[model samples]
Target chain A: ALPSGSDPAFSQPKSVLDAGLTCQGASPSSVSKPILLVPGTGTTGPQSFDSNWIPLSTQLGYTPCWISPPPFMLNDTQVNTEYMVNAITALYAGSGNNKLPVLTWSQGGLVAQWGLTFFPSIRSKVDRLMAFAPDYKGTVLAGPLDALAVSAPSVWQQTTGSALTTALRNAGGLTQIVPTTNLYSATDEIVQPQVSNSPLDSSYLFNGKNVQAQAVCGPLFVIDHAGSLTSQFSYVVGRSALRSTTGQARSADYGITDCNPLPANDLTPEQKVAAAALMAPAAAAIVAGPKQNCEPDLMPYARPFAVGKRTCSGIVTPL
Target chain B: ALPSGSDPAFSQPKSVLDAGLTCQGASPSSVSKPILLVPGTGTTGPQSFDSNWIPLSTQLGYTPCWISPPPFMLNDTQVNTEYMVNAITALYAGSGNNKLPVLTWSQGGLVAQWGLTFFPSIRSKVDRLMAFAPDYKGTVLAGPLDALAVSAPSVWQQTTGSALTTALRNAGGLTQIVPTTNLYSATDEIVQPQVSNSPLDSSYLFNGKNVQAQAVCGPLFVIDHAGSLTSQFSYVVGRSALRSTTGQARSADYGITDCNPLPANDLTPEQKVAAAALMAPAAAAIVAGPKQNCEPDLMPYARPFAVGKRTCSGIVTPLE
Candidate 1:
C-alpha cells in the first residue's frame, strides 16, 4: 500500500532506493557521513518525523537519509534485515567507508539492532544508534495476538523473551559497538516505560572498545511515543544527543526554559487491584486458550502466545 | 494539521465541500429518504465510517450522505450548529421535502441534537436521529483546561453538566420532535458507556413520540468509539436500526452470525478505590485552581473541566 518511492520492495530503476537515498540539506560530498532516518511500524519516512527532524538535521550540518520499509516495517524480519543490510551496505560503500549514523524510532531501532548484530558489514559501517522510543523489550499493549497476526511479524520479534528478541539481547544490541543513546518517555501510550529501558550500563564492550548506553529522559518534554519523534522540545534534546560524541544528554541540557514536570506515580493500591482484576482475565485468555470460536482475528494464536506470554503478560504490572 | 480536503473551515469554492457529498446506492431518486453521516472530533467523513456504511446503505435502498466538519469539529459549538443547520436545510430543500435520517458519531450527535433543539426547521425535516457512541454526558479526558481553552468550544459544551448541556437536557434533546435512536457500546474507549447513557428510556418523549436507546456488547467487536461507526458488524446492526420504524434494534436483531461478546463489568472494589484515590487530587486541583502555569496547549480548560470532571473521572475506572 506504500507509494512507489516509499517501499524499497517496489522500487523502480531510478527510485529513491535504487539511487541509494535522497540526502536532504548539504550535498553528500560535503558531510563526513550521512545520517539515516529509519521509521517505526505503520509510519512512512516523512510522516514518522512529522516535521521534527529536518530543522535539527540542518542545524547539525548532517545530511538526512531515509529508509521506508513495509507497513509494520518488518513483515518478514529475516528478509527485512537483509534488505536493511543491503541499504546500509550501499550507503557505506557510496560514502567511501565513512561510517554513517542512524536515527531510529520504534521498530526501526529493532531493525537496525538486528542488522548490527547479524551483519558485521553493517556494524563496521555505523557511527551511532540514536533511538527514540524504541521497543527493545517489546510491549504488553500489542499483547500475544500481535505476534500471531499475519500482518505483523515485527511484533513477533518484538515480544519480550521471544527467540529473536532473546538472541538480540544476548548479542548486546542495546550495548552496541557504537555509542548508543536510548531516548525514552515514561508516559509513552503505546510501549511501556520499563520496556523502553532509559538506564545506563557500562560493563560490556566489543573488541576491548567499551559499548556504552546513555539514557535520556523525555517525559518532561510532554512527548508521548509518537510525539517523541515529532515534538519541538524532543528535537532540541535529540539534536544535543546526536551531536555528542559520547551519545549523552540530559533534560536540562537543551534549555527548555521550563521546570521538568515530575513523572506520575505508579498506580495507586486500589488502582493496582482494580487493574489487575480487570486485566487478569484478558491476559489469561491471551495465554493458552484454544483458537477462539467467536473472533479468531481478534485473538492471538496460542502457539506464539505460549512462546513469550509469561514474560510479556507480567509487564503490565498495574494496568 | 489536517490534510487539505479534511478541514472544511479552509475549504475553497471548487473544493470537496462544494461537491456536497458522496452517496452510495442505485440513485438518490430510488431511495425514500437520504441518510446523512456526520463524523466526530478530528475525523473526516470517509475515515469515520471506514467503508462500513456504503454496503449497508445500498442494501437498505437508501442514499448515504456525509459531512466533513472542520478540524476539532465543533470547536465552537454555536458556530458548528449554524454550519450543520445550513447543510441540513439545503439537503432538505433540495430533496423535494423528503425528510432525511441522520447517523452521527460522538460530537456529531451533539451537533444534530443542538440543530434539532434550536432550529425548528431542522427538526421538521429530520426523520430518525441514529447516534453511535454519542457522548450525551461529557468526557473528563479533556481535564480541567477544557472550557478555558480558546480552542475546542464543542468540548466545553459537552462537559457532563455544562450550561449548554443543562439547557439541552431541560429542552429534552433526547426526547426530540423526531424519532431518536441512541445506539451505544458498553466498551467505548473514549466516552464512558454510562455517561453515553446506554440504558433504554421509553418514559421520556416529546409530544408523545417516544425516544429509544439500545445497549450492544462489543469487548470482542475489537471496536472502540471510532471503530463503532466503521465495523462491518456494527453497520449491520445500525442498518437494521435505520430501517425499523420503531427507532431501536438489539444486538441480536441484525444477526452478527457470531456469538455475542459480553460487556466488561463495573470497576471492582480495588479499582474503584484506586480510581478515586488517583483522581481525587487531579479533581481537586481542577475544581478551584488558578490557570495552569505549564504548557496551556496540553491541558483542557476549566469551564468544561468543572462540568464533567466528577462523572468523567469516575469512568476512567481503569487507567485510560
Candidate 2:
C-alpha cells in the first residue's frame, strides 16, 4: 500500500480473487492505443472506487479514467462530458496517440456508453468500448429499491444506462458503435436480468445481431446470477474481451467459458449452507425476483454431478 | 448537495452549479467518444461527477465512466488498464476503432499519466487528453506560511505537483504517445506559475531564445495565482486549444490575455482602499511563494478581477 495519508482507496484488495487479479493487457510502453477505464461509484467515501477495475487497468497498459457518480442519477449527468474529453485529450498527448479505447463496468458501462455517444471530443478521441454487465436498456431495480436512492423522473433518468440507451437511439448513435458488445448474465442478482432489462421487446429493438447481451457461457451449467461475477462466466467474458478472441457474434452463448460453481466433485453440507447464505443477500438485491424458485447456489444445483467438490471441504474431506 | 450525509467536498459545488453544468457538451444521441472524466482534488469532488461531467457527457453524445477514489490512494482498480488488460479490453468489443478517449484532472491526472506509461490498453483505447490546469511538474508552495493556517496534509498533497513530474520521468509505458500537448496557462494560481513549475532549463536550451519563463506570456498588470482561474488567460487558453484543432502536438501559448487584477478602467479612490484590503489576504496566502515580487499580488491570486469587484461592492458601495 502507499504511505499513510495517501489515498488508501487506490490500494488494497480484501478479496482473494481481487488480489490475484492484476492488470494484464498489452503493455502501455509497447502499444499505441490509449485506454479509458470507467469505475463504479463510492467516491469520496471509504469504498471510493470499484474494487475490481483498478488493477485490471494498470496491467493492461491503458490509461484508465474512473467516472465519478452523478448527483441525481442519469438525468443529472446530462452535460458533464467536457472534463472527461479534455482529460483524455491531454493524456493521449502523453501516449502520442490521439485515439483511445474505453472499458467500463456496471453503471460505469453506461457512463462510458454515454461519453462516447454524446461528447464530441470524447467521440473523436475514442476507438473502442468494453462494458461489463452494462445496463444498456435500463436498470429494473435502483431508485425504489433503497432508502438512499431518490426518486427518478423516468426509466431513462433512473440509471445511467437508461439515459445512454435513450440518447443513443434518439441520435442514431447506436449504429456508430461498431465493436460494442454488452456482456451480461441471466442470473445477475445485482442488476435486472438481461431478458427483463434489455429484452428484444417491441419498445427496444437494436439489430439483434449487432447487440450481444446474454447469459451465453457460465451459468453455462449453473442456474443463475450468483456465479455471474465470481463464476467462470464472468471470467470468460473478461478474458475474451481483453483478448478480442470471442467467436461468432450471431451464435448466442457460444464459445465463452461459463463458470460452474461446482466444477469439481461434490457439495458438502457447509458448502450448501454457505452458498445459501451468500445467495440469500444476492437474490434479495435483485428486482422483481420471486423468492421461492431462487436456488440458493446455482453452481452445484446446476451441475449436480460436481456436487461432491462444490462444498467448502466437500462431503468426504470435512474441513 | 444531496441528502443523508452527502460528501461536503461535493456538496458545496452541487449547490453552487446546481445541474446546469451537467451536460454542457453535445448530445449523447450523436456517435461520440464516451468521455471518461477524472476529478481533481479540492476543486473536484462527488459533485464534479454527478453534476459537471455527467451532463457534459450527455451533451457530447457519450457516456462517462466515472471513477470513485481509489480503494486507497494505491489500491488497484478492477476495470481499467490498471487491473488486467482484459478489464479494459471488454469496453471496446464493438467500437470500430477498438479504442476510447479518456480525460482526468489533478490527482486523476497522475493516474492518467501512469496508465499511459504502464498499460497498453490505455494506449490503445485513448484518443486525446484534456488536462485543465494540471500540475504536471508538481507545485512547490507546500509549506505553511502562517502559524494560523492548518497543516493540512490533504492540501499539501495537491500542491506537490512534483509527483506528476517524477512519474513522467520514470514513465515506463508512454513511448507510444503521439501528437500530445499540455494545455496549461502561465497564470494558473493553483498550479504554481507555469514559469516556475515548468522545465526552465529545457525551455532555455530548446527555445534558443534565452526566453525567460516570463516571456511565455505577458505579465499580469496586477493579478497573481488565485485569480487566474477565471481570467482571460484561462478562457483564452481554452479557446486557443479548441481553435488550434490540431491533433496531439505542442501548440504555443497564446498570450493575448494577461489576467490583470485591476479594473478595466481606472479605479476611484474609494475602490483603491477596498482593493488593497482584498489583496491583503491574497498576499498573505502567498507569503511563502518561491519568488515574491515587489507587487505581492502578482502571482498567487486567482480571479483577481472578481476579488476587486466584490471588495468594491462590499466596502465602497455600502453607502449606496
Candidate 3:
C-alpha cells in the first residue's frame, strides 16, 4: 500500500517541485482557481501552454502556472505522475486551499488525473480537468513505437490494452473525482479508433464530459494528433470548461455548432504559427532518442498486495 | 525528356510480367473491360483486391486480374513503376488492344498515372483509372520515415513537397490523359492533411473526379492508411467508375449522400474480415525488412537531357 497524502514520504522537496513550475499574473493566493498547465509527451510547459492557453488564462485574471517535470517527457509515467501530485499539492496549499483548474495535453492528462487517483486527497485540490488528447486510453499507434519502448518507459504503457490502461480502469483510477472535460479529434492519427461513436474511444472517460472535435470545429477539418495540442477548438472548449464550475463544455453554451471551423474558436494566425513551431521539436524527438529492449513498470504502490501484508519495505527488488 | 511509349528500351521481359499477372473468370480478350488490380506499398495484388474488389468484379461478369511485381513493396519506386508499366503494356497487348479498367492503391496510383504520362500511347489503352488513397501529391508522414528512406527508395520520393512530387506536377505528369477518379479518406493516418476542404488533398488529380470516403460514407469514421486499400466505399465508387466512360463518380448518379456510412456500400461481414486479414502481413513487413544509407533514383528515361544528347547510352552516370 502507498503512503497517505499527509505521509512524509508523499511530500516532495519544495525546491525540486517549485523548480519546474512557473506562474505569471496574480499570485496563487489572489486567484480563486489558479489555472495549471500540464503538458504531454514531447513538450515542455511553455511549449504546451504558452501558445494559447497561457495568454487566455492571464486575460481572465486567473494566474496560470506551467509545470514541467522535465522538458524531455519520454521517461517513466509513474515518476512524472508523482511530480504532478507534488505540483497539485504545492499549488493548492499555496492558493489558500483553493482548487486548481488544470489544462492538460496527451500523457500529461493521464498524469494529472492519476495524481487524484493515487493521492486521493488531491481530489479536493483540483476544481476541473480540461484534457486535450489525453493518453488515458492506450493507443494502437504504440505498436509502431515498440522499437523505442525500452528506453522510453512511457511507450510500452501508452499502448492500447496495456496493463497500465487496465490498471487505470480498475475501480476509481479513471473515474472522475474532479469535474473533467475531454476534447479530442476523431481523426487523431496516433490514437487509433478515436471514433467518437465507439465506447472504447481514447477521448471518452467515465463520468467525464467528452467533446468531439468534429462536433465543435467541423467534420471536414481533420485535426492530426499533433494538431490536437494547439487546435483553437480545443483551446476554446478548454477555456470554457475552466470558467464553468462543473467543467462541462456544452457547445450550446459557447454558441458552438457542428462544423463551425476557426471563426467559432478564434486564434490569430500569429498565435497559431507560434504554437505549431513550439511543438515541432517534440515530434522530431520521437525518432531521435535512445532505444531500449525493456522498461519495466515502476508503480509498485498500485500493484496487487495481500491483505495481511500491510508493509512491503520500499518496493522494487525484482523479486 | 523521356523516351516515347514505343521505345524498345522501355519494354520489360514478357515472361517476367506474365509471372505476376493472374486473371480469374475468362481470357483477358473475352471480357469487355477487365479490371486490373494494382496494389500500393506494403501490399500485393491479392492482398489489395481479393477480399472485396476481386469478388465484386466476378459478380459483375467482368474478369479481374491481380498483378504483383514482387510480394514486398518497400523497394525502389522507379523500379516498381516499370513493373506497373510492364504489367499495363503486357495486359493491353494480351487483351488484343481492348481498353482495360485499372484500380490502384497508394503508390500504385502514382505509378499507374505516371505510366500514362511516361507512355502517352497507353492513354488510348486504359478505359478508366480509379485510384484509392493514392500517394499522388505525397505525404508529410514520410518525414518520420527518413531513416527508412535509404533502404526503401520510395520513402524520400513520397515526402510532401519533395522534388519527385514537384517533378510529377511538372507538365503532364499528374494531369490526366486517361479518364480517372481518385477515392481517399480525409482522415488517413499515415498521410497528413487529407482534408477534403483543402485543394491540395491527396485525392485530387487534375481532370480526375475526387471522391472523399467521408462524402460517400460518414464524417465521424476515419479510414486509416492501410484501411484505404480495402474500404467498401472505395470498392463501390471504383466499381461505379469502371462502368462510366468519363470515369466521373458523381454522388447523384449513384444515389450517394453526405455521411451515408456502409449500408450504401454493402459488403458482407465475412468478406470485410477476410479482406482485412489479407492486408495484415503487409503492414507488419513495413518495419521488418532493411536499413540502407541510400537508394538512389532508378528511372533514367524520365531525366532531363540536352538536345544534343539524343543518343545517351542507358543513362544514370550520376554526372548527368
Name the candidate that leads on DockQ: 3
Candidate 3 runs further than 4 Å off: A1-319, B1-5, B27-32, B144-149, B161-163, B196-198, B214-221, B254-266, B277-279, B305-320
lDDT score, candidate 2 = 0.36
Per-candidate TM-scores read 0.49, 0.31, 0.54
For all candidates, state DockQ relative to the true structure: 0.02, 0.01, 0.04
Q: For model 1, what is the C-alpha lDDT against the true structure?
A: 0.49
Give a tens-digit lDDT track for model 3, residues A258-291. 3333322445677766766554556434333333
lDDT of 1 by residue, B1-320 (tens): 00112122221333434343555542333444578777676555655543445435545776677766554353455455555666666567657777788887777777787667655657677877777667655554444364665324455556555555554554456555567655554444456523223233212223322222222221222334543454444455566667776755444465424212211113344432332232233234334433331211111211222233222223112112
lDDT-based ranking, best first?
Answer: 3, 1, 2
Q: Is candidate 1 or candidate 2 better by lDDT?
A: 1
The positional error of residue A319 in candidate 1, measured at the CA in angstroms, is 39
Task: Return the clash pairs for model 3, or none.
Answer: none
Better of 1 and 3 by DockQ: 3
Cα deviation at B42, candidate 2, in Å, is 35
For candidate 1, give fnat to 2 decimals: 0.00
lDDT of 2 by residue, A133-185 (tens): 55555455432222112122222232323323444445444343435545555
